[PDB]
mmCIF file of C-alpha atoms in Angstrom:
data_model
loop_
_atom_site.group_PDB
_atom_site.id
_atom_site.type_symbol
_atom_site.label_atom_id
_atom_site.label_comp_id
_atom_site.label_asym_id
_atom_site.label_seq_id
_atom_site.Cartn_x
_atom_site.Cartn_y
_atom_site.Cartn_z
ATOM 1 C CA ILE A 637 5.185 13.688 8.265
ATOM 2 C CA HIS A 638 2.330 12.939 10.680
ATOM 3 C CA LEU A 639 1.190 10.105 8.426
ATOM 4 C CA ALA A 640 4.798 8.914 8.496
ATOM 5 C CA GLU A 641 4.855 8.616 12.291
ATOM 6 C CA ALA A 642 1.407 7.006 12.217
ATOM 7 C CA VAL A 643 2.671 4.393 9.754
ATOM 8 C CA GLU A 644 5.807 3.827 11.832
ATOM 9 C CA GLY A 645 3.700 3.176 14.926
ATOM 10 C CA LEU A 646 1.397 0.860 12.990
ATOM 11 C CA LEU A 647 4.385 -1.153 11.745
ATOM 12 C CA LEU A 648 5.850 -1.294 15.252
ATOM 13 C CA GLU A 649 2.534 -2.581 16.627
ATOM 14 C CA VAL A 650 3.215 -6.103 15.354
ATOM 15 C CA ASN A 651 4.564 -6.572 18.883
ATOM 16 C CA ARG A 652 1.156 -5.526 20.219
ATOM 17 C CA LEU A 653 -0.515 -7.919 17.772
ATOM 18 C CA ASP A 654 1.619 -10.730 19.190
ATOM 19 C CA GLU A 655 0.992 -9.592 22.779
ATOM 20 C CA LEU A 656 -2.796 -9.560 22.465
ATOM 21 C CA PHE A 657 -2.633 -13.306 21.721
ATOM 22 C CA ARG A 658 -1.609 -13.862 25.362
ATOM 23 C CA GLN A 659 -4.483 -11.798 26.813
ATOM 24 C CA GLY A 660 -6.953 -13.156 29.344
ATOM 25 C CA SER A 661 -9.872 -12.867 26.915
ATOM 26 C CA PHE A 662 -8.010 -14.511 24.030
ATOM 27 C CA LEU A 663 -6.725 -17.288 26.277
ATOM 28 C CA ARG A 664 -10.224 -17.720 27.738
ATOM 29 C CA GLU A 665 -11.912 -18.182 24.375
ATOM 30 C CA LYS A 666 -9.063 -20.417 23.191
ATOM 31 C CA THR A 667 -9.412 -22.686 26.225
ATOM 32 C CA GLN A 668 -13.199 -22.787 25.775
ATOM 33 C CA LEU A 669 -12.872 -23.636 22.070
ATOM 34 C CA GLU A 670 -10.321 -26.349 22.843
ATOM 35 C CA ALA A 671 -12.747 -27.635 25.479
ATOM 36 C CA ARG A 672 -15.583 -27.869 22.936
ATOM 37 C CA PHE A 673 -13.634 -29.661 20.205
ATOM 38 C CA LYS A 674 -12.054 -31.890 22.858
ATOM 39 C CA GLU A 675 -15.557 -32.658 24.150
ATOM 40 C CA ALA A 676 -16.505 -33.763 20.643
ATOM 41 C CA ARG A 677 -13.304 -35.814 20.425
ATOM 42 C CA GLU A 678 -14.055 -37.324 23.845
ATOM 43 C CA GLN A 679 -17.539 -38.295 22.671
ATOM 44 C CA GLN A 680 -15.967 -40.049 19.682
ATOM 45 C CA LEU A 681 -13.323 -41.566 21.973
ATOM 46 C CA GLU A 682 -15.995 -42.881 24.349
ATOM 47 C CA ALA A 683 -17.862 -44.448 21.431
ATOM 48 C CA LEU A 684 -14.605 -46.102 20.350
ATOM 49 C CA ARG A 685 -13.900 -47.185 23.936
ATOM 50 C CA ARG B 1420 -14.105 -1.365 40.537
ATOM 51 C CA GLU B 1421 -16.321 -3.105 37.987
ATOM 52 C CA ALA B 1422 -14.697 -6.496 38.630
ATOM 53 C CA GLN B 1423 -15.020 -6.127 42.409
ATOM 54 C CA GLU B 1424 -18.668 -5.119 42.030
ATOM 55 C CA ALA B 1425 -19.239 -8.193 39.856
ATOM 56 C CA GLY B 1426 -17.432 -10.347 42.427
ATOM 57 C CA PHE B 1427 -14.363 -11.497 40.468
ATOM 58 C CA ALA B 1428 -10.642 -11.219 41.196
ATOM 59 C CA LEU B 1429 -8.489 -9.063 38.911
ATOM 60 C CA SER B 1430 -5.219 -10.973 38.413
ATOM 61 C CA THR B 1431 -2.588 -8.984 36.534
ATOM 62 C CA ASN B 1432 -0.099 -10.809 34.316
ATOM 63 C CA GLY B 1433 1.971 -7.685 33.694
ATOM 64 C CA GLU B 1434 0.768 -5.401 30.932
ATOM 65 C CA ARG B 1435 -2.156 -7.809 30.504
ATOM 66 C CA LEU B 1436 -5.032 -8.502 32.890
ATOM 67 C CA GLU B 1437 -7.309 -11.464 33.541
ATOM 68 C CA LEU B 1438 -10.232 -12.466 35.747
ATOM 69 C CA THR B 1439 -10.134 -15.330 38.244
ATOM 70 C CA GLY B 1440 -13.523 -16.460 39.507
ATOM 71 C CA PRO B 1441 -16.221 -19.134 39.309
ATOM 72 C CA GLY B 1442 -16.996 -20.161 35.747
ATOM 73 C CA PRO B 1443 -17.428 -17.932 32.702
ATOM 74 C CA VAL B 1444 -17.311 -14.174 33.271
ATOM 75 C CA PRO B 1445 -20.260 -11.966 32.236
ATOM 76 C CA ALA B 1446 -20.173 -10.731 28.659
ATOM 77 C CA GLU B 1447 -20.127 -7.068 29.703
ATOM 78 C CA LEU B 1448 -17.311 -7.767 32.168
ATOM 79 C CA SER B 1449 -15.317 -9.620 29.502
ATOM 80 C CA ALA B 1450 -15.820 -6.767 27.036
ATOM 81 C CA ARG B 1451 -14.711 -4.204 29.620
ATOM 82 C CA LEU B 1452 -11.621 -6.256 30.486
ATOM 83 C CA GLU B 1453 -10.734 -6.581 26.801
ATOM 84 C CA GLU B 1454 -11.246 -2.871 26.130
ATOM 85 C CA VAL B 1455 -9.201 -1.845 29.178
ATOM 86 C CA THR B 1456 -6.305 -4.125 28.228
ATOM 87 C CA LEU B 1457 -6.390 -3.021 24.586
ATOM 88 C CA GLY B 1458 -6.364 0.615 25.676
ATOM 89 C CA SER B 1459 -3.484 -0.086 28.054
ATOM 90 C CA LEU B 1460 -1.265 -1.609 25.385
ATOM 91 C CA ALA B 1461 -2.337 1.139 22.967
ATOM 92 C CA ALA B 1462 -1.084 3.557 25.622
ATOM 93 C CA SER B 1463 2.153 1.565 25.646
ATOM 94 C CA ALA B 1464 2.425 2.050 21.871
ATOM 95 C CA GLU B 1465 1.727 5.766 22.320
ATOM 96 C CA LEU B 1466 4.449 5.786 24.985
ATOM 97 C CA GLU B 1467 6.841 4.382 22.386
ATOM 98 C CA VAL B 1468 5.761 7.081 19.921
ATOM 99 C CA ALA C 1451 -10.908 -21.219 13.977
ATOM 100 C CA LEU C 1452 -7.822 -19.918 15.792
ATOM 101 C CA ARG C 1453 -6.573 -18.366 12.548
ATOM 102 C CA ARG C 1454 -9.994 -16.789 12.038
ATOM 103 C CA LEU C 1455 -9.879 -15.453 15.607
ATOM 104 C CA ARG C 1456 -6.404 -13.945 15.092
ATOM 105 C CA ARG C 1457 -8.038 -12.014 12.257
ATOM 106 C CA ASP C 1458 -11.283 -11.182 14.029
ATOM 107 C CA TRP C 1459 -9.715 -9.477 17.017
ATOM 108 C CA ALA C 1460 -6.884 -8.448 14.727
ATOM 109 C CA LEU C 1461 -9.379 -6.040 13.142
ATOM 110 C CA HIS C 1462 -11.083 -5.571 16.518
ATOM 111 C CA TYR C 1463 -7.871 -4.104 17.919
ATOM 112 C CA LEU C 1464 -6.808 -2.314 14.752
ATOM 113 C CA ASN C 1465 -10.074 -0.389 14.379
ATOM 114 C CA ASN C 1466 -9.594 1.595 17.597
ATOM 115 C CA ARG C 1467 -6.228 2.958 16.468
ATOM 116 C CA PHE C 1468 -7.198 3.310 12.807
ATOM 117 C CA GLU C 1469 -10.328 5.388 13.464
ATOM 118 C CA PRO C 1470 -8.457 8.568 14.545
ATOM 119 C CA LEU C 1471 -6.141 8.110 11.556
ATOM 120 C CA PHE C 1472 -9.167 7.905 9.265
ATOM 121 C CA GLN C 1473 -10.573 11.001 10.975
ATOM 122 C CA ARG C 1474 -7.395 13.033 10.438
ATOM 123 C CA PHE C 1475 -6.496 11.463 7.055
ATOM 124 C CA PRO C 1476 -9.783 11.188 5.129
ATOM 125 C CA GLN C 1477 -7.917 11.122 1.798
ATOM 126 C CA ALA C 1478 -5.659 8.145 2.636
ATOM 127 C CA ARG C 1479 -8.545 5.706 3.094
ATOM 128 C CA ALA C 1480 -7.294 3.071 0.651
ATOM 129 C CA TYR C 1481 -3.745 2.950 2.024
ATOM 130 C CA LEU C 1482 -4.832 2.824 5.660
ATOM 131 C CA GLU C 1483 -7.386 0.062 5.125
ATOM 132 C CA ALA C 1484 -4.887 -1.883 2.999
ATOM 133 C CA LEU C 1485 -2.346 -1.639 5.813
ATOM 134 C CA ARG C 1486 -5.050 -2.824 8.212
ATOM 135 C CA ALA C 1487 -5.674 -5.846 5.982
ATOM 136 C CA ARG C 1488 -1.933 -6.525 5.766
ATOM 137 C CA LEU C 1489 -1.659 -6.446 9.561
ATOM 138 C CA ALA C 1490 -4.636 -8.806 9.725
ATOM 139 C CA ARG C 1491 -2.884 -11.175 7.320
ATOM 140 C CA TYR C 1492 0.269 -10.977 9.446
ATOM 141 C CA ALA C 1493 -1.663 -11.769 12.625
ATOM 142 C CA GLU C 1494 -3.585 -14.632 11.005
ATOM 143 C CA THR C 1495 -1.020 -16.366 8.786
ATOM 144 C CA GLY C 1496 2.092 -15.316 10.697
ATOM 145 C CA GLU C 1497 3.816 -14.175 7.501
ATOM 146 C CA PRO C 1498 6.614 -11.702 8.293
ATOM 147 C CA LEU C 1499 5.930 -8.005 7.771
ATOM 148 C CA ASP C 1500 8.441 -5.969 5.779
ATOM 149 C CA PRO C 1501 8.857 -2.398 7.097
ATOM 150 C CA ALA C 1502 10.129 -1.146 3.733
ATOM 151 C CA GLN C 1503 7.157 -2.387 1.699
ATOM 152 C CA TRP C 1504 4.608 -0.480 3.844
ATOM 153 C CA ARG C 1505 5.789 3.115 4.251
ATOM 154 C CA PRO C 1506 4.549 6.274 2.537
ATOM 155 C CA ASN C 1507 7.351 7.375 0.234
ATOM 156 C CA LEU C 1508 7.822 11.138 0.322
ATOM 157 C CA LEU C 1509 7.968 12.624 -3.163
ATOM 158 C CA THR C 1510 7.853 16.392 -2.455
ATOM 159 C CA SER C 1511 6.560 18.928 0.034
ATOM 160 C CA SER C 1512 5.188 22.419 -0.508
ATOM 161 C CA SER C 1513 6.488 25.039 1.898
ATOM 162 C CA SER C 1514 5.248 27.519 -0.711
ATOM 163 C CA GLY C 1515 2.419 28.522 -3.029
ATOM 164 C CA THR C 1516 3.916 31.792 -4.189
ATOM 165 C CA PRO C 1517 5.691 30.949 -6.434
ATOM 166 C CA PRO C 1518 4.022 27.689 -7.470
ATOM 167 C CA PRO C 1519 6.261 24.679 -8.173
ATOM 168 C CA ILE C 1520 8.039 25.551 -11.421
ATOM 169 C CA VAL C 1521 9.899 22.476 -12.674
ATOM 170 C CA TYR C 1522 12.034 23.259 -15.711
ATOM 171 C CA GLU C 1523 13.269 19.890 -16.985
ATOM 172 C CA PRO C 1524 15.378 20.390 -20.132
ATOM 173 C CA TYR C 1525 16.636 16.804 -20.075
ATOM 174 C CA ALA C 1526 13.206 15.228 -20.379
ATOM 175 C CA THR C 1527 14.200 11.570 -20.535
ATOM 176 C CA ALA C 1528 11.805 9.000 -19.114
ATOM 177 C CA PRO C 1529 13.815 8.456 -15.888
ATOM 178 C CA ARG C 1530 14.047 12.234 -15.462
ATOM 179 C CA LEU C 1531 10.352 12.789 -16.234
ATOM 180 C CA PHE C 1532 8.431 9.940 -14.601
ATOM 181 C CA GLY C 1533 11.053 9.004 -12.008
ATOM 182 C CA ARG C 1534 13.244 6.001 -11.356
ATOM 183 C CA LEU C 1535 12.388 2.695 -9.699
ATOM 184 C CA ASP C 1536 15.682 1.641 -8.165
ATOM 185 C CA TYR C 1537 16.184 -1.841 -6.742
ATOM 186 C CA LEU C 1538 18.064 -3.436 -3.865
ATOM 187 C CA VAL C 1539 20.205 -6.530 -4.423
ATOM 188 C CA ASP C 1540 19.743 -9.325 -1.877
ATOM 189 C CA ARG C 1541 22.211 -12.137 -2.640
ATOM 190 C CA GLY C 1542 21.807 -11.558 -6.374
ATOM 191 C CA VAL C 1543 18.020 -11.150 -6.073
ATOM 192 C CA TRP C 1544 16.408 -7.984 -7.421
ATOM 193 C CA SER C 1545 13.934 -6.493 -4.945
ATOM 194 C CA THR C 1546 11.865 -3.323 -4.890
ATOM 195 C CA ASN C 1547 9.147 -1.658 -2.853
ATOM 196 C CA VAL C 1548 7.296 1.613 -2.392
ATOM 197 C CA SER C 1549 10.182 3.180 -0.464
ATOM 198 C CA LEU C 1550 12.458 2.719 -3.507
ATOM 199 C CA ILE C 1551 10.357 4.891 -5.844
ATOM 200 C CA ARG C 1552 12.035 8.140 -6.799
ATOM 201 C CA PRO C 1553 10.220 11.256 -8.035
ATOM 202 C CA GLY C 1554 10.750 12.506 -11.562
ATOM 203 C CA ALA C 1555 9.774 15.802 -13.102
ATOM 204 C CA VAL C 1556 6.056 14.989 -13.131
ATOM 205 C CA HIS C 1557 5.905 14.243 -9.389
ATOM 206 C CA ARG C 1558 7.301 17.623 -8.383
ATOM 207 C CA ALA C 1559 5.361 19.710 -10.899
ATOM 208 C CA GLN C 1560 1.984 18.899 -9.326
ATOM 209 C CA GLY C 1561 -0.088 21.969 -8.576
ATOM 210 C CA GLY C 1562 2.358 23.958 -10.671
ATOM 211 C CA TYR C 1563 3.955 24.086 -14.086
ATOM 212 C CA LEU C 1564 6.140 21.605 -15.966
ATOM 213 C CA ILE C 1565 8.323 23.382 -18.525
ATOM 214 C CA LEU C 1566 9.863 21.043 -21.093
ATOM 215 C CA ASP C 1567 11.865 21.565 -24.263
ATOM 216 C CA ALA C 1568 9.921 20.227 -27.235
ATOM 217 C CA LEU C 1569 13.248 19.446 -28.890
ATOM 218 C CA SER C 1570 14.137 17.311 -25.868
ATOM 219 C CA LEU C 1571 10.890 15.342 -26.122
ATOM 220 C CA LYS C 1572 11.455 14.819 -29.846
ATOM 221 C CA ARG C 1573 15.083 13.761 -29.380
ATOM 222 C CA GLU C 1574 14.629 11.382 -26.453
ATOM 223 C CA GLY C 1575 11.629 9.609 -27.976
ATOM 224 C CA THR C 1576 9.653 10.008 -24.754
ATOM 225 C CA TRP C 1577 6.829 12.028 -26.300
ATOM 226 C CA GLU C 1578 4.557 8.984 -26.554
ATOM 227 C CA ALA C 1579 4.910 8.192 -22.851
ATOM 228 C CA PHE C 1580 4.413 11.838 -21.919
ATOM 229 C CA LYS C 1581 1.283 12.028 -24.070
ATOM 230 C CA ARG C 1582 -0.120 8.948 -22.351
ATOM 231 C CA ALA C 1583 0.731 10.497 -18.981
ATOM 232 C CA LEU C 1584 -1.095 13.703 -19.902
ATOM 233 C CA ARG C 1585 -4.232 12.049 -21.271
ATOM 234 C CA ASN C 1586 -4.669 8.967 -19.078
ATOM 235 C CA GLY C 1587 -2.886 10.255 -15.983
ATOM 236 C CA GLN C 1588 -0.589 7.228 -16.246
ATOM 237 C CA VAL C 1589 2.769 7.965 -14.641
ATOM 238 C CA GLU C 1590 5.018 4.952 -14.272
ATOM 239 C CA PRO C 1591 8.570 4.894 -12.896
ATOM 240 C CA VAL C 1592 11.141 3.628 -15.368
ATOM 241 C CA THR C 1593 12.259 0.041 -14.771
ATOM 242 C CA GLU C 1594 15.442 -1.924 -15.421
ATOM 243 C CA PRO C 1595 15.154 -4.694 -18.049
ATOM 244 C CA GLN C 1596 17.050 -7.307 -15.996
ATOM 245 C CA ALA C 1597 14.676 -6.902 -13.034
ATOM 246 C CA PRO C 1598 11.522 -8.866 -13.923
ATOM 247 C CA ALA C 1599 9.420 -8.064 -10.858
ATOM 248 C CA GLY C 1600 7.929 -4.586 -11.118
ATOM 249 C CA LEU C 1601 5.294 -2.568 -9.253
ATOM 250 C CA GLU C 1602 1.862 -1.966 -10.781
ATOM 251 C CA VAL C 1603 1.530 1.800 -10.402
ATOM 252 C CA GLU C 1604 -2.045 3.041 -10.547
ATOM 253 C CA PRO C 1605 -2.937 6.018 -12.746
ATOM 254 C CA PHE C 1606 -2.411 9.393 -11.074
ATOM 255 C CA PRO C 1607 -4.672 12.366 -11.904
ATOM 256 C CA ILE C 1608 -2.510 15.049 -13.494
ATOM 257 C CA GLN C 1609 -2.906 18.407 -11.754
ATOM 258 C CA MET C 1610 0.056 20.102 -13.459
ATOM 259 C CA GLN C 1611 0.167 22.541 -16.365
ATOM 260 C CA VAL C 1612 2.593 21.625 -19.128
ATOM 261 C CA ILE C 1613 4.155 24.612 -20.863
ATOM 262 C CA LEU C 1614 6.409 23.236 -23.573
ATOM 263 C CA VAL C 1615 8.969 25.661 -24.980
ATOM 264 C CA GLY C 1616 10.769 25.395 -28.275
ATOM 265 C CA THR C 1617 11.592 26.752 -31.678
ATOM 266 C CA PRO C 1618 8.843 26.600 -34.336
ATOM 267 C CA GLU C 1619 10.794 23.920 -36.198
ATOM 268 C CA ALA C 1620 10.867 21.726 -33.087
ATOM 269 C CA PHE C 1621 7.059 21.842 -32.911
ATOM 270 C CA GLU C 1622 6.621 21.247 -36.653
ATOM 271 C CA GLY C 1623 7.615 17.701 -35.719
ATOM 272 C CA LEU C 1624 4.883 17.536 -33.059
ATOM 273 C CA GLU C 1625 1.851 19.431 -34.402
ATOM 274 C CA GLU C 1626 1.312 16.664 -36.975
ATOM 275 C CA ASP C 1627 -0.005 14.482 -34.146
ATOM 276 C CA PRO C 1628 -3.713 15.267 -33.567
ATOM 277 C CA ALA C 1629 -3.375 14.344 -29.891
ATOM 278 C CA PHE C 1630 -0.928 17.235 -29.516
ATOM 279 C CA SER C 1631 -3.523 19.772 -30.643
ATOM 280 C CA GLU C 1632 -6.015 17.918 -28.455
ATOM 281 C CA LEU C 1633 -3.834 18.448 -25.371
ATOM 282 C CA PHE C 1634 -2.010 21.734 -25.987
ATOM 283 C CA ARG C 1635 -4.386 24.446 -27.146
ATOM 284 C CA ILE C 1636 -2.682 27.723 -26.146
ATOM 285 C CA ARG C 1637 -0.140 28.957 -28.702
ATOM 286 C CA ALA C 1638 2.111 31.551 -27.065
ATOM 287 C CA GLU C 1639 4.056 32.576 -30.158
ATOM 288 C CA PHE C 1640 6.943 35.009 -29.741
ATOM 289 C CA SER C 1641 7.292 37.536 -32.526
ATOM 290 C CA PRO C 1642 10.887 37.317 -33.817
ATOM 291 C CA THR C 1643 10.782 41.110 -34.262
ATOM 292 C CA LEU C 1644 9.341 43.955 -32.211
ATOM 293 C CA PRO C 1645 8.132 47.279 -33.636
ATOM 294 C CA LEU D 1114 6.137 -28.462 -0.602
ATOM 295 C CA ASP D 1115 6.117 -24.855 -1.787
ATOM 296 C CA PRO D 1116 2.957 -22.897 -0.888
ATOM 297 C CA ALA D 1117 3.655 -20.383 -3.662
ATOM 298 C CA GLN D 1118 3.347 -23.175 -6.249
ATOM 299 C CA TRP D 1119 -0.254 -23.758 -5.097
ATOM 300 C CA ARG D 1120 -2.637 -20.805 -4.863
ATOM 301 C CA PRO D 1121 -5.893 -19.762 -6.526
ATOM 302 C CA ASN D 1122 -4.726 -16.603 -8.295
ATOM 303 C CA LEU D 1123 -7.329 -13.835 -8.264
ATOM 304 C CA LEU D 1124 -8.025 -12.079 -11.571
ATOM 305 C CA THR D 1125 -11.079 -9.841 -11.107
ATOM 306 C CA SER D 1126 -13.355 -8.225 -8.543
ATOM 307 C CA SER D 1127 -17.093 -8.844 -8.459
ATOM 308 C CA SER D 1128 -19.539 -6.210 -9.684
ATOM 309 C CA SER D 1129 -23.326 -5.991 -9.658
ATOM 310 C CA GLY D 1130 -23.345 -6.052 -13.478
ATOM 311 C CA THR D 1131 -24.668 -2.481 -13.613
ATOM 312 C CA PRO D 1132 -22.465 -0.755 -14.478
ATOM 313 C CA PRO D 1133 -20.907 -3.645 -16.406
ATOM 314 C CA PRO D 1134 -17.129 -4.090 -16.455
ATOM 315 C CA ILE D 1135 -15.860 -1.489 -18.926
ATOM 316 C CA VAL D 1136 -12.088 -1.856 -19.185
ATOM 317 C CA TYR D 1137 -10.455 0.946 -21.164
ATOM 318 C CA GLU D 1138 -6.861 0.218 -22.211
ATOM 319 C CA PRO D 1139 -5.614 3.316 -24.059
ATOM 320 C CA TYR D 1140 -2.066 1.917 -23.971
ATOM 321 C CA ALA D 1141 -2.415 -1.252 -26.046
ATOM 322 C CA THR D 1142 0.561 -3.569 -25.607
ATOM 323 C CA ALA D 1143 1.122 -7.266 -25.009
ATOM 324 C CA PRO D 1144 1.840 -7.134 -21.231
ATOM 325 C CA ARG D 1145 -1.146 -4.899 -20.431
ATOM 326 C CA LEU D 1146 -3.641 -6.595 -22.780
ATOM 327 C CA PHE D 1147 -2.962 -10.300 -22.265
ATOM 328 C CA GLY D 1148 -1.408 -10.055 -18.798
ATOM 329 C CA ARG D 1149 2.149 -10.560 -17.620
ATOM 330 C CA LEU D 1150 4.196 -13.524 -16.378
ATOM 331 C CA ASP D 1151 6.473 -11.953 -13.796
ATOM 332 C CA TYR D 1152 9.138 -14.085 -12.144
ATOM 333 C CA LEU D 1153 11.346 -14.144 -9.089
ATOM 334 C CA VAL D 1154 15.097 -14.402 -9.654
ATOM 335 C CA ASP D 1155 16.961 -16.681 -7.244
ATOM 336 C CA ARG D 1156 20.708 -16.055 -7.646
ATOM 337 C CA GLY D 1157 20.397 -15.408 -11.366
ATOM 338 C CA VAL D 1158 17.844 -18.163 -12.081
ATOM 339 C CA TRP D 1159 14.298 -17.192 -13.064
ATOM 340 C CA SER D 1160 11.583 -19.160 -11.253
ATOM 341 C CA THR D 1161 7.812 -18.858 -11.510
ATOM 342 C CA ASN D 1162 4.728 -19.516 -9.383
#
C-alpha cells in the first residue's frame, strides 16, 4: 500500500515537472543559453551585414 | 538570509523564487535557490499526499 | 540542449524524492528507476504519461503465515492457473497495461502450497505450461487471440510448493515424462486399506 | 509524417564479453526464437511500425 501511495504521488508530480520549467534557475540558464546561441547568430549576421 | 548576505533581492513569483541583482548570481547562491524551491514544491506534493 | 536540460534537472529533481523510496523499498529498485526514466522521458519529449500503465498491480496480500496460503485449484486451466490478461476497448482498439493483469492460482500460492488435481492438468492440456512455469519460473497471463499487442512478462522465481493430488491412474499418464520425476520427487501414496 | 514509422529499434544490451551472451530458451517456439511482429489495431485494421 505504501508503495501504492508513493507511485500515486510520483504520477501526480508531472505537474511539478511542468512547474520546475518556470523556475528562476531554469529560466536563467535558458536565457543565458539563448544569449549564447544568439551571440553566435549575431556574429554570423554581422558577417552577412 | 543567504540572499541578503550575498546582496541580491529575493523576488517571489508564487510557489517559485528568483533572484534580482547585478549580473549572474554566485554558483552556491544559485544552487541554494534551486534546492530551496525544489524542496518547497516537494512540500507542496507532500501536502497533496 | 533544452530537451537535454529538461532531462538533466528532470533527474536532478527526481533523485531527491526517489532516494527515500529506494531507502524504504530496496527490493523495488528496477521499477522505481524505470519510473524515474519514464518521468524523464515525459519531461524531455513531452509525451503524455498514462496513469494506468505505471501502477503496481496488487496480486495478493498476506495478513497471515499460520496457516500458509493454501490454494486448492481443482479447475487448473491456464487462465485459472497463470491468471488472465484482460483488455480495455478504446474505439475498437485493444489496449492493456500492468493494472489489467489478474492473478491466477500461481500468484496467490507464493510462500505456500498449490494443490492441483493431476486429472485436471491431464484433461485441460495445461501440464506443459505448468511444467515450464515450475522449471523456468515462467508465469505468463493468458492472452486473447484477437488482441495482438501483449505484455512481455519476465520470469518469476517460483517460491511455492506444488502438491498434486490424484488417483494412481491419473498419474500413470504423467510419470512417463522424465521432467515430472525431475520436479516431483516425494510420493505420498495412500494405502487403499488400513490394518 | 509518423514518428513511429521511423525509429532505430533496439535489440540487445551491451556486455563486456565476459561473461558472453548466453541466451537460454527452454521454451522453443517461433515467436520467442525468431522474434515477434506485434501490431496496433486501429478500428479493426492491423497496422505496423
